[PDB]
């Protein structure tokens, strides 16, 4: 389920997220999410699936 | 935050300064010429110091706990101080 949400909602919902960026702070992206480039993205990863999926995969 | 010494070590002065202030202002209903202004300036500079320190300590991390900081900082009075 968590992997499905990962590869679904990015790789839609992020359309609305990126349209505001056309019109920057590190805290504004957070409250938009919880509702030349390079963004900061982190979300809660639970431990029993944090050990089966490598850390370096998320960077790719 | 009884288990947390720095925020506690800040808050005790916050209670004590009002202990002094509430008793002091009731004495005169006119201008305080009994060294009221000297103590008042000491109190306000001390409160500025301790308030910035406790804001640093606070920034556990509950939505209400984080959410109270912005009520003060909707002014940038302590987003700069």
């Amino acid at each position: 389920e968590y992997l499905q949400a990962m590869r679904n909602f990015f790789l839609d919902t992020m359309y609305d997220f990126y349209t505001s960026i056309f019109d920057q702070n590190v805290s504004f992206l957070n409250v938009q999410l919880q509702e030349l480039d390079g963004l900061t993205l982190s979300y809660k990863v639970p431990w029993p699936v944090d050990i089966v999926i490598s850390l370096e995969c998320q960077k790719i | 935050f009884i288990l947390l010494k720095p925020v506690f070590h800040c808050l005790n002065e916050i209670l004590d300064l009002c202990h002094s202030f509430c008793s002091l202002v009731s004495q005169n209903l006119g201008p305080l010429d009994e060294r009221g202004a000297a103590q008042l300036s000491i109190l306000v500079k001390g409160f500025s110091r301790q308030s910035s320190l406790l804001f640093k300590i606070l920034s556990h991390q509950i939505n209400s706990d984080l959410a109270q900081l912005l009520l003060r900082l909707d002014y940038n009075k302590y987003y700069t101080q």
Binding site: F28 | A67, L70, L71, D74, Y75
Partner: protein, 420 residues
Amino acid sequence: REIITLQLGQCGNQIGFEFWKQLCAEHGISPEGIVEEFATDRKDVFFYQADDEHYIPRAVLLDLEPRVIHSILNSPYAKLYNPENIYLGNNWASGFSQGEKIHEDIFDIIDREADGSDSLEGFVLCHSIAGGTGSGLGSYLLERLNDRYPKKLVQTYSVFPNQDEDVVVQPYNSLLTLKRLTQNADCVVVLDNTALNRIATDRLHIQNPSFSQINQLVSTIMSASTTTLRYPGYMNNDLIGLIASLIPTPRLHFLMTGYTPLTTDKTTVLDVMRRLLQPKNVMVSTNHCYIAILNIIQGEVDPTQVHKSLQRIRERKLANFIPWGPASIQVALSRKSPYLPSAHRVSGLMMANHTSISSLFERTCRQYDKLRKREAFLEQFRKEDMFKDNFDEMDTSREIVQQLIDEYHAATRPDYISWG
């Protein structure tokens, strides 16, 4: 503690009668004041409790030229009260002099009701600005209480008269009344005729019996502002705890109100907050900034949305307030009322100090100053002639409201660090 209500004047006794009928229908009691078995509450603040649980209200009734007071007299709610306190022009000086001669026995009525109370919190009066019989008289009794008791509070709910300008001494009377309001009162809640006219013409299609629906809206407001008293809350169950945050300064103590449904015949905390941010949901009509805002909500709320909402309320900056210092909005919750149909579930009430009301004062100041330049609009009535032969109280009131408007316009500035 306990709060004693006062009522005088035609509009004041009308809104008091509507308030008591509102709290009669709202709680589980009879129109003679017998408790209903099917109903728990505290009604000990605005009603004295009896042995058959007759909650006889703390309402002292003063009348002058009674026509509608007679209709109040023969009523099926005339068994709710009988404290035996009813005691008999359209000028400020007239009502002032009429209150002046009977100040002793009405003060006996005051002290009798004070002895009826064990403790005390405040006096509310039902009054209308420039109401004729109410005007001047209300300023006089305000002077009497302010002389008599510096230990208590006065809250005042009164409307601003605008009939879209035969009576031309009305700006003088309202000016003298508001002079006594700024200097002899501690907190003022003021409303407009025009904003209630807008909300009434929007929610409905009535034009002529507008007073009656205005009374309904006043009753809903006065119940809402008192709900944390009447339904047992746990904070600001004293009046002074409510008043303390909104007023830093003894002349700028005027409080404006709002209420979320215009028509009341889900909503989320975000929706009702942003609705309450509108001036069209506020019943009072450079950039102006609030000093402090207070909101009380009553309904079926979910407690986790509310922190989400004030996060995003910071984020959108949908309010613009910066007095000079760290005074922000205060949000609170009260009980959704039983014993009535709870439709339009979540409803909010809003209380702020905003500098924009000075402009409305300035409008009246612009009118009065114009009439003062012509000096033909006192009409030489004998009452104002006795009370001031030189008419210098009008100039004193002019300099006081000049100080008030200047305090307002400086209070807008982020250099209000001094003179606050």
